[PDB]
Amino acid sequence: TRCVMNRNGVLEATISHFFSRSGLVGVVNLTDGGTDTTGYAVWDIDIMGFVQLRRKCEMFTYMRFNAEFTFVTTTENGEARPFMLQYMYVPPGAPKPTGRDAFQWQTATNPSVFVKLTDPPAQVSVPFMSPASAYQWFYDGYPTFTYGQCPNNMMGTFAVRVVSRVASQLKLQTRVYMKLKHVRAWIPRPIRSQPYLLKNFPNYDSSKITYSARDRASIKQAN
Amino acid sequence: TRCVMNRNGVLEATISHFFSRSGLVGVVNLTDGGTDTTGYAVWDIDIMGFVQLRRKCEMFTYMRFNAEFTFVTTTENGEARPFMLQYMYVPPGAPKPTGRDAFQWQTATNPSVFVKLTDPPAQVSVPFMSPASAYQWFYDGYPTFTYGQCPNNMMGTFAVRVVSRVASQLKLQTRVYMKLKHVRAWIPRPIRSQPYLLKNFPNYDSSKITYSARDRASIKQAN
Amino acid sequence: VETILEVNNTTDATGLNRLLIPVSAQNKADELCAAFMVDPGRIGPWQSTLVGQICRYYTQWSGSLKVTFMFTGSFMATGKMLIAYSPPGSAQPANR
Amino acid sequence: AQLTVGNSSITTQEAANIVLAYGEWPEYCPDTDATAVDKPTRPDVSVNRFYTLDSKMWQENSTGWYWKFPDVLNKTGVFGQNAQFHYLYRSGFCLHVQCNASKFHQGALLVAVIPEFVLAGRGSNTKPNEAPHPGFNTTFPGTAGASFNDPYVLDSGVPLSQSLIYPHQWINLRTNNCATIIVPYINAVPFDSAINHSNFGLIVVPVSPLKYSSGATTAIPITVTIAPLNSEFGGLRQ
Amino acid sequence: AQLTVGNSSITTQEAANIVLAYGEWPEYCPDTDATAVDKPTRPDVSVNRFYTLDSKMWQENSTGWYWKFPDVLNKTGVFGQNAQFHYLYRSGFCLHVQCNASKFHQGALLVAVIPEFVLAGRGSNTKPNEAPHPGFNTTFPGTAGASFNDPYVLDSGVPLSQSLIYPHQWINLRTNNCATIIVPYINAVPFDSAINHSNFGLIVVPVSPLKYSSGATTAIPITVTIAPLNSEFGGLRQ
Amino acid sequence: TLWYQTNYVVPPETPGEAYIIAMGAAQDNFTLKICKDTDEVTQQAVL
C-alpha cells in the first residue's frame, strides 16, 4: 500500500490552471469546387460545443477571460500542401460572409490573417469582448425590452477560405484549439449530472433520470 | 609507452554526466491503411527496454530526475514528406487511446503537440511524476493491500497518429531519444553480470551461470 | 570501495572457489604461490571488481590503487608470505 | 561487557569498531503532513529489546543464510503485535551478529545489509504465463530465515564480489567472533506496510568454507541478535 | 606493527627490547686522510632496504646455520653492485631474525653475532703440504649460508657455552618468536674489501632441539631480514 | 605476486589448508575521462 503522507502543492487547483491546457472546441470542413459547394466555411465562436468544459464552465455563473485561439489545418487525406489560406475574425454585430468572393472578405474592420498551409498553425488573442463586466452562462429572464438566450455571450465568429479565384479542388478539415488567459470566475454552481439534449438550454429527460452514485446491494454492506 | 602522468578532471564521473548524452529507448512503427491495421500507435513509457542503461539504472536503487524526450520520425523508406502528426502524452491513471479517431485524442487534460513531419523533431520535458519522493527499481514485497511490480514507476505513456480522416497510406518508424535532467541517485547497487530473461523481473539462468572474469590456464601464470 | 578479485580464474573452479587463493603446507618455501596483473579494464581477475566494471565504462583512467589481502585459517597457525609488486615494463619475477 | 535494554541482556566484547550504515544514525520521522495531523505512536520502552533468534548451524557445505526485515519480526512479541495492527511503520535497527567457535576452526563469513533485497526467479523459462516467480514462503521466509542456492550470484543475478558497497563487515574466526551493524530507515517513503514490504534484508555467506580436524565440532553455531530503534507505528487497524 | 624503509616493508611486534652490539650505534667514518682527500659516497636512499633471504627449515636433527657479512650481500641488488665495484666499504647492520612456529612446538635457538668469525680446518692431519683448510665454498658460503658440523665447538675450536660474551639473544618458542640485533662496523681499519674479507658472521644454533607431536609441521621456518646502515663505499673499480 | 617466504607452520590437529582473499579498490587520486558504453552486455534489448 503506497499510502502517501506528503502534502502536495496547490497550484493545479487554481481556476487558472483548471481552464489552461488549450484544447479543441470546433472542427470544420472546407471543400472547394465549382457550383456544387461553397468554397468557404463559417463557424460561430462557441464554448459549450464539446461537453467536457461545458461542465467546467457551468460550475460557475459569471466568468471573464481572454481567449487564445490556434487554427491548425490539414487535408482530409492528411497531406500538407503549399496553399495560402485566409482566416478572418468577425466581431459581433457585423455581417457574416455569405459567399467565397463576397465583399465581406475585403473588409478592413474585420481583422484577418494570411498564412501558408505549410506554415505552422496560426495563433490569435481575443480580449474580453462583452459589453458587460462578465459573461453570464445563465440569464433567467427574457431579453425582450426564445427564452434565456444571453444577450451578450457572442464573442463573434470566424470565416475561413483560400485566397484564389480558381476552384482549387481541395478538401480540408480545420481544428481549432482554445486557451484561456487571466480567468476570473464568480458564484460557483453545482455540477450537472444529467446528460444534455440540446445546446444553450439546460433541459433534461424527466424519465431516464440518472443517479449520480451507482447502485449497490444494501446499506449495511459497504463492500 | 604513452604512460600518462597528468591527473585528469572529475566532471565526467558525476552521475549527472553518467546519465546525460540522450539516447534511444523506444522505436515504434505506424502504418495507416483501411480495415487491416490500426492507423495509430501506443507506446508505454519505459526505461529498462534497451539493456545498456538498465545496467546503469540498477547500479542504484532510488532515483529522481526529469525527462527530456525527443521524437524523431521518418518513413520506413527514408523520405520525409509534409504531413502533420500528433503526439500525445498520457499521465498515469488515465485511459489510453483505443482507436485512431477515438475520443481520447480530443482530450484536454491529455497534453499533445502537433508538428509537421518536415519540421525538426519535437522535444518535451516531463517532470518527476511519482507520488513518492523517488523511483524504486526494486520493491520486494507485494503491492496488494504478480510479485515485485513497483506501484509507482509508470511515468505515463505516449500515443502517435496522423491528423486526418483519410487513411493516408503511410508507413513510419519513429525513434525516441531520452535525456535526463537533474538526476539524484541513492543507495548504490552492484552491477548485474548475468544476461536477462524477461523484463521488470531480475531472473537468471541457474545453469548457464556466466563468470564475470574469463578463464586462463593457471593461477601461477599471469600472462 | 574495496571489492573482491576473481583471482582464481580458471576452468576448474565453479563457485566461490574462484575467489579464494588456496594455501597449504604441502607447498614448499621460496616458491611462487599465486600472482596476477593489475589491470581493471582487462580480461582477467578484475572484471568481478567494481573498479574494473567501472573502467569498462570509460576509456582512460589514471591514479593509485590499494590492494589488500585477508587470511582465514586458524588462530594458532602462522606463516610468512612475500607480497611483491613489479611495475610494468618488466616480467613477473622468476624467484623470490 | 554487557548490554541490557528493556528486559534483555546480552554480553559481548568492548567495541566502538561498529559500522554506521551510510554514516547516519536512526531518527524519528520529521514534520510531514502525517506528523502534523496526528501523532504516530513512539514506543521506546519494551519493543526495544535484544531479540535472539534461533541459532544457525554453519557446516562444511553450507551455502549461507538470509532474512527479511521487518518480516522476521512480524510474529514476535509485542513488536509483532504492533506490526500487524498498524499499517504505518518506521524504524532503525541494531544487528549484533555473533559466532561461537574455537581457535581450531577456520572459515570466513561475510555480514552485509542489503536494501530492497530482491530474490531472483530461477529456472529460466521465458514465458508470460509460466513466470516461475519465487513463492510466498521463499521471498518472505519469516522468522527462521531461508538459505541460498547460488551464492556467487546472491540468488539475485548480482555478483557477490561487488557486494561490499553495501554496509558490510568481515567475520574471521581468528580475529573476532562478533560484529555489529546499525542501519537506519531505508525507504523512499517515510512509512509503509510492515507486513507486505521488506525494506532490506540481511545476508550471511561463507566466503571461506568451514574446515576442522578429526574430533572437532562439525557445526558452528552462529547467532543473530536484533534491537529496533526509534520505531514508530501508525493507523491501528483491527 | 610495521617497518617500511625504501621500498621494503616488514611487520613485527612492538619492541624496544633490542640489543646494541657493545652499546654503540653505527656511524659514518670520521675525519681520516681518506675523508680529507675525497668524499666516499654515502648511499642512504635505496641500498637501505630490509632484504629477506631464503627461509630456513629447522628440523629435529638440524645442526644450525650461519652466514658471512658482507659476503651474503655481495651478489644481491644495488648493494651487491656497489660492493663488487668499490674496494672500500663500511657499514652497520640491523638484523631482525624471526621464527614462525605454533604454540605446540618446543625448542630453543641462539642468535649471536661473531666478529672475525673464523671457521676451523677439521680432519686433523698435522702436515705442511696437506693443510686441510676449509675450501672457498665453505668459508665464504655466500647467500644461502651453510650449516654446522660440530656445534658444541662452533666448528672453530671454541666452546659454545662461552659464546654469550658475544652480542647474543635467546629465541624461545614460548615467549617470543622474533629478535633483533644492531651491529656497527667492527674492524681494526676503517675500510676494507667487501668481497675477500668478512668482518663478522651470524650464527644460529638449536641449543634445544625441536620437538613436536604426531601431525604437526616437521620443519619450522626461520627467516632472517637484514638492513644496512650508514654505509659508505670508495674507489670505483671497473 | 604472492610467494611462500616460509612454509605454512601448523600445530597438531588442524587441516593446514587455508584460503587468502584478495580485495582491491582505487585511491582518491584516481580520475576518469571520456565515457564509452561496455561490451560485456551482449544483449541488445530484452523486449
Alpha-carbon gap, residue D64 to D154, rounded angstroms: 10
Q: Is E55 on the interface with C (CB under 8 A)?
A: yes
Cβ contact, residue pair E221, C25, below 8 Å = no
Angstrom CA distances, E51 to C15, E77, E95, E96, stand at 39, 9, 10, 10
- Cα-trace Rg, chain D: 19
Element (H, E) at D34: helix D33-37
Write out the DSSP string of A3-20. Answer: ---PPPPSSTTSHHHHS-
D107's grid cell:
572459515
Q: How many CA atoms lie within 13 A of E149 on its CB side?
A: 10
With cell 508507413, the residue in question is: B171
With a CB-CB cutoff of 8 Å, which residues 12-41 of chain C face chain B?
18, 21, 32-37
Chain Cα centroid distance, residue B9: 30
Minimal Cβ distance to D32: which of A1, A2, A6: A6
Beta bridge partners of A123: A70
Listed residue (E205, E210, E225) closest to E111, CA to CA: E205
Percent of chain D that is helix, strand, coil (3-state, to 5): 10, 35, 55
CATH number of the CATH domain containing D219: 2.60.120.20
Minimal Cα–Cα distance from C66 to chain B, Å? 17
Identify the three-state secondary structure at position B159: strand
Domain count, chain B: 1
Query: Which resolution, in Å, applies to this structure?
Result: 4.4
Supply B10's cell numbers. 572529475
Q: Do C74 and D174 touch (CB under 8 A)?
A: yes
Name the one residue in this structure whose C-alpha cell is 656511524.
Answer: E27
Interface of F with D in 1-47 (CB under 8 A): 13-15, 17-19, 21, 23
Q: Which helix (H) or strand (E) holds D168?
A: strand D168-172
Q: Which of C32, C54, C74, C85 to mutate against chain F (most F CBs within 10 Å)? A: C74
E chain contacts of residue C25, beta-carbon cutoff 8 Å: 217
Domain at A3, CATH number: 2.60.120.20
- Tell me the residue range of the domain where D152 lies: 1-238
CA dist D183 and D192 (Å) reads: 17
Side chain identity, residue E92: G
Of E54, E98, E103, the CB nearest to C30: E54
Q: How far apart are CA E109 and CA E101, in angstroms?
A: 12
Q: Is B8 within 8 Å of chain C by CB?
A: yes
Q: Do chain A and E touch: 3 or more Cβ pairs under 8 angstroms?
A: no
What is the residue whose three cell numbers read 580520475? Answer: F31
CA distance B180 to E52: 57
Experimental technique used?
cryo-EM
Domain that includes residue A168, residue range: 1-223
Are A5 and D196 inside 8 Å of each other by CB? no
- For residue A180, give every residue at least 6 positions away whose Cβ sits within 8 Å of its Cβ, in sequence order, or none: A19, A20, A65, A66, A67, A68
Looking at the DSSP assignment, which residues form a beta bridge with residue D223? D98
- Cβ-proximal residues to A103 (8 Å cutoff; 6+ apart), any chain: none
Please check whether residue E28 is in contact with residue E232, taking contact to mean a CB–CB distance below 8 angstroms. yes
What Cα–Cα distance (Å) separates residue D29 from each residue in D15, D40, D41, D42, D183?
Answer: 29, 9, 11, 10, 15
Q: Do B190 and D119 touch (CB under 8 A)?
A: no
Task: Return d(Cα A109, Cα A55) in angstroms, integer.
Answer: 34
* Rounded-to-integer distance, Cα E54 and Cα E17, Å: 26
Q: Could you tell me the three cell numbers for D186?
A: 531505508
- Amino acid D102 reads S
d(CA E101, CA E199): 31
Q: Which helix H or strand E contains D161, and what residues bound it? A: none
CA E159 to chain centre: 20
Closest of A129, A131, A154, A150 to residue A43, by C-alpha: A154
Residues constituting chain A:
223
Counting the structural domains of chain E, the total is 1
Name the residue in chain B with its Cα closest to that of C6.
Answer: B213
Cell of E98: 624471526
SS3 E139: helix
Biggest alpha carbon–alpha carbon distance for chain B: 74
Instruction: Determine, for residues D108 and C75 on separate chains, whether the beta-carbon distance falls below 8 Å.
Output: no
> DSSP string covering B79-141, please?
----BEEEEEEE-TTSPPP-SSSSGGGG-SSS-EEEEETTSPPEEEEE----SSSSEES---S
CA distance D203 to D186: 16
Continuous segment of H or E residues that includes residue D234: strand D220-234
Neighbouring-strand partners of residue E233: E41, E89
CA distance D193 to A204: 48
Alpha-carbon span E29 to E34, nearest angstrom: 10
Cα–Cα dist D110/D82, whole Å: 32
